[PDB]
Amino acid sequence: TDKLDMNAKRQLYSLIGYASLRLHYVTVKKPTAVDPNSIVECRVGDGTVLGTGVGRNIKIAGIRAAENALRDKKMLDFYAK
């Protein structure tokens, strides 16, 4: 079971994706034969991390990362100014 909201990125970007904020996904552990997990962070320009995701590929990881950013309401409150 690998349950996942395919709109998370789109939904997060729509709330807090100002151009001035430089919201970006960065792969911080790319998967390997020795370790298949992918870990991705959803970041703003000044480096602060909003969401971290993990799963079998980068795309699925980067989606959980937003899924997770969306669940943090103090963070959303702040970054929608």
UniProtKB/Swiss-Prot annotation:
Residues 7-75 form the DRBM domain. Disulfide bonds: none annotated. Present with 4970 molecules/cell in log phase SD medium. DsRNA-specific nuclease that cleaves eukaryotic pre-ribosomal RNA at the U3 snoRNP-dependent A0 site in the 5'-external transcribed spacer (ETS) and in the 3'-ETS. In vitro, cleaves synthetic 5'-ETS RNA A0 site in the absence of snoRNA or other factors. Has an essential growth function in addition to pre-rRNA processing. This is Ribonuclease 3. It comes from Saccharomyces cerevisiae (strain ATCC 204508 / S288c) (Baker's yeast). The chain holds residues 363 to 443 of 471 of the full protein.
